[PDB]
Design a protein around this nucleic acid. Structure first.
Lengths: 103, 32, 115, 155, 84
RNA sequence: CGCAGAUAUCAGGAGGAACACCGGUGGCGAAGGCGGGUCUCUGGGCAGUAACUGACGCUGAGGAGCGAAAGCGUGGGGAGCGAACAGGAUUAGAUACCCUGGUAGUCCACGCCGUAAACGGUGGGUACUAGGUGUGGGUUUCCUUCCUUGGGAUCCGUGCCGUAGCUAACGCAUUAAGUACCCCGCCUGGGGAGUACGGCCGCAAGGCUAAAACUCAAAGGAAUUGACGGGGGCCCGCACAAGCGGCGGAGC
C-alpha cells in the first residue's frame, strides 16, 4: 500500500511552485510512515485574497480515508509552510488517537 | 492546589540530577 | 483392585479447573482436567469445562470401583456447584462438603497490582 | 424499536392447500413483485413432487422442514479483545423462516436448468436428508457444540 | 404490658436490649479465664473466628481481654482453632 | 515448566519474612510511627484527695538529640516479592504497562546520611466566646432494679452538623482560619535557582547556608457560564442489530 497513498495536490488560485509539491508529497509520506491503512488524501491550498485581512491569509482543508473512520484536518495561516505543518500536526493528533483507539 | 508549579520544580530538579550523574566523575577527579 | 468409598478434591481457579479422586488417606485413583478434555488456553475457565472434566473423572472412578465420594473444594470457582451437579449426575453419592479455600494468617507477601 | 416492537403481518391461508407456510414460501421466493410467477412455480413444483411420490407434497415438505429447521443458532458479541460467538435458542417463527431462507438460497445454485426443478429436487433431497440446507444446519449445530462454553452468559 | 422504650414506668432499667449490651457483666460469666473454654466458645463462630463489638456489645476493655484469652487458648490448644 | 514422570494429592521434615477474624473515623506516642503470644526493664498521660514548696512559669535565636522509606559500609541470613536485567506478546517503533524468570535490596546486629505531600498543606503557651450530636476513659448523685449506651452533672481526649463572628472565595467555627496579649521562624513579582562560586557536615550519594548578570508584563488563588471527556445515570433516531437490494469489479 506504500505508493497506494492517493496523492491529490491542488490549489484553486495560488502561485504554486512545484517544490511545494515536493513538500506536500514528502509531508504526506511522513504519515504513510505510521499509518498503513490509507486510500485517499484529498487536499486543498486556498487563498481568500481579501484586503486588510484578519491575520489568516491562506487556508487548507484535508480529509483522509481509513478503513471506515475518515479523518479531517483543517488549518489556516499566512503562507504555505505553517499551513502544511499545522495540518500535518493536527492529522498526527488524529492518527495517534485513531491508532490508540484502533485496538 | 495545582501541580504545574511542582512540575516545573520537578523538571529543573531532574535535569540537574542527570547532569550530576553524567559529571559524577569529572567533579570528583577535578575539584580536589 | 478397587475402593468403594473415597474422597474428591476440586481445585477451581480463575484460569483453569481440575479435580482428583482419592482415598481419605491421600492415595489417588483417578483424575481429569480441561486439558485432557480438550479445551486450551483461555476457554477453560468456563463451568462447561468443569462439567466435562468432573464427568470424565467420575466415570474413571466408576470404572476403578467407586460408588460414594467425599468432596473437598478449593479456590475461586465460577463452576464449583456446576462440577458438583456433574458428579451427582455421574452416579456418585456426595459424602461431605467443605469450603476449605486456603486463607493465610496475613503471611507471605502477595504480588503487586495490575492494570 | 427503542420504545417497543410492532405486530406481525396476518398471513393468509392458501386457496388450494390449507396452510400459511405456503404463502410464506411464495413470499420468500418472490423477486421483483412477480407474485403470480412465484405462485405458479411453486404449484408446478409441488405437483411435480406429487407425481414423484404418489402422495400430497405437503407432508414431505413439512418432513423436510422437520429435518432442516433448527431450534438453536448463533448470536455474536464483541467482548474483551476477542469477539465471541454464543448459542441462542430460536423461537419457531424465525426457525421456520431461516430454514426457508436456507432452502431457497441453496436451491438457486443447483443445475436442474430451471428453478422449479431445482427447488422441487431440493425439497425432496431435504425430506430424504441430503440437501445442502441440511448440511448447513448441521454446520450450525457443529458450531453450537464448539461454543457451548459461553452459555452462562444467558443472552 | 410495656414497650421496649418509652419506659416511663419502671426505674432506669437494669436490663439490656438490642443496641445496648454489656454481655459479660450482664450474664454468662464466672470470670475471664483462658481456662474456661466453654465460655470463650460463645464469642466466636463455628469457623473459629471472633465476633465484633457491634455484634456482641462489650466495651473495648472486655473485648480485648477476651480476645487475648482466646488467643492464649489457641496457643495452648485448649480451643479448636480454625485450620486443617 | 513437564513427557528423564510434572500439575494435583497425601505423610513427614528443613526453612525464613509477615502475624488474618479482634481492628474501625477506635487507643498510645512530642513527631516519625505503633498490633501473633508470654516474661523482664522502663517511660508518659488522665481523674480524684486536693496533704506539700509558694510564681519556681511560657517561649527560645544559636545549639544538641530523635527522626518513614530508599541508599552506604563490616558481618550474618536469604522462603516469598522484586530495581536492574533476559526473553515472550502487543506495538508503526516499545529501552514501558501485560506474561515468564530473576540479581542488588527488602530481614538481623553495629554504625552512617538526616531528607518527603515528614499534611490538620493551620508554631507553641493562655482566658472568654450559641448549641446539638455520636464516641473512648475516669469520677459522682437520683428513678433505683441499684445485675443498667440507666439518667443527670463534671473532667480529659476524639469526630459530624451548625449560630454570631471571620475570610478574595472555598469554607473555619468552643479541637477556630473568631475575639487579645507574650515569644520564635518565615515571605516582599515569575524565571534564572534552593542553581553556580565560597564554606560546614558526610566514606560516597548528597544536604544546609545562598546570589548575580540577563529576561518576561506577568506567574498565580478561589469561584461562574460554556465546551469537552475512550466519567457516570436516564432516553431517542434505519445508528447498529434482524431483513432486502445495491456501490465499488466491467461498458456507456
Amino acid at each position: 500500500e506504500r505508493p497506494h497513498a492517493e496523492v491529490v495536490v491542488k490549489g484553486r488560485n495560488v502561485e504554486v511552485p512545484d517544490h511545494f509539491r515536493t513538500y506536500v508529497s514528502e509531508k504526506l509520506s511522513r504519515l504513510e510512515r505510521f499509518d498503513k491503512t490509507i486510500y485517499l488524501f484529498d487536499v486543498e491550498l486556498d487563498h481568500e485574497r481579501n484586503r486588510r485581512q484578519r491575520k489568516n491569509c491562506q487556508h487548507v482543508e484535508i480529509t483522509a480515508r481509513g478503513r471506515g473512520p475518515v479523518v479531517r484536518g483543517e488549518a489556516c495561516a499566512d503562507s504555505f509552510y505553517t499551513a502544511f505543518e499545522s495540518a500535518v500536526q493536527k492529522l498526527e493528533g488524529r492518527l495517534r488517537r485513531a491508532k490508540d483507539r484502533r485496538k | 492546589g495545582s501541580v504545574i508549579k511542582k512540575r516545573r520544580k520537578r523538571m529543573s530538579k531532574k535535569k540537574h540530577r542527570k547532569l550530576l550523574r553524567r559529571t559524577r566523575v569529572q567533579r570528583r577527579k577535578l575539584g580536589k | 483392585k478397587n475402593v468403594p468409598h473415597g474422597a474428591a478434591h476440586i481445585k477451581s481457579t480463575f484460569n483453569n479447573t481440575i479435580v482428583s479422586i482419592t482415598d481419605p488417606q491421600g492415595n489417588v485413583i483417578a483424575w481429569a482436567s480441561s486439558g485432557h478434555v480438550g479445551f486450551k488456553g483461555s476457554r477453560k475457565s468456563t463451568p462447561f469445562a468443569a462439567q466435562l472434566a468432573a464427568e470424565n473423572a467420575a466415570r474413571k472412578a466408576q470404572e476403578h470401583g467407586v460408588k460414594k465420594v467425599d468432596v473437598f473444594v478449593k479456590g475461586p470457582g465460577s463452576g464449583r456447584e456446576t462440577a458438583i451437579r456433574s458428579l451427582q449426575a455421574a452416579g456418585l453419592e456426595v459424602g461431605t462438603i467443605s469450603d476449605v479455600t486456603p486463607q493465610p494468617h496475613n503471611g507471605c507477601r502477595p504480588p503487586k497490582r495490575r492494570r | 424499536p427503542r420504545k417497543g416492537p410492532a405486530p406481525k403481518r396476518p398471513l393468509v391461508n392458501d386457496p388450494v392447500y390449507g396452510s400459511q407456510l405456503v404463502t410464506q414460501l411464495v413470499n420468500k421466493v418472490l423477486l421483483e413483485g412477480k407474485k403470480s410467477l412465484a405462485e405458479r412455480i411453486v404449484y408446478g413444483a409441488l405437483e411435480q413432487a406429487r407425481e414423484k411420490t404418489g402422495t400430497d407434497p405437503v407432508v414431505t415438505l413439512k418432513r423436510a422442514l422437520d429435518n432442516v429447521k433448527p431450534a438453536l443458532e448463533v448470536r455474536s458479541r464483541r467482548v474483551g479483545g476477542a469477539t465471541y460467538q454464543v448459542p441462542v435458542e430460536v423461537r419457531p417463527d424465525r426457525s421456520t423462516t431461516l430454514a426457508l431462507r436456507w432452502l431457497v438460497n441453496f436451491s438457486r445454485q443447483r443445475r436442474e436448468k430451471t428453478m422449479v426443478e431445482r427447488l422441487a429436487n431440493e425439497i425432496l433431497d431435504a425430506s430424504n436428508g441430503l440437501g445442502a440446507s441440511v448440511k448447513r444446519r448441521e454446520d450450525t449445530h457443529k458450531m453450537a457444540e464448539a461454543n457451548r462454553a459461553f452459555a452462562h452468559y444467558r443472552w | 404490658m410495656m414497650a421496649v422504650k418509652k419506659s416511663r414506668k419502671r426505674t432506669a432499667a437494669t436490663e439490656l436490649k438490642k443496641p445496648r449490651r454489656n454481655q459479660l457483666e450482664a450474664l454468662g460469666v464466672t470470670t475471664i479465664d483462658y481456662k474456661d473454654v466453654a465460655v470463650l466458645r460463645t464469642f466466636l463462630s463455628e469457623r473459629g473466628k471472633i465476633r465484633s463489638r457491634h455484634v456482641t456489645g462489650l466495651t473495648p476493655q472486655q473485648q480485648r481481654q477476651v480476645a487475648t484469652a482466646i488467643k492464649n487458648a489457641r496457643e495452648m490448644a485448649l480451643l479448636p482453632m480454625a485450620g486443617p
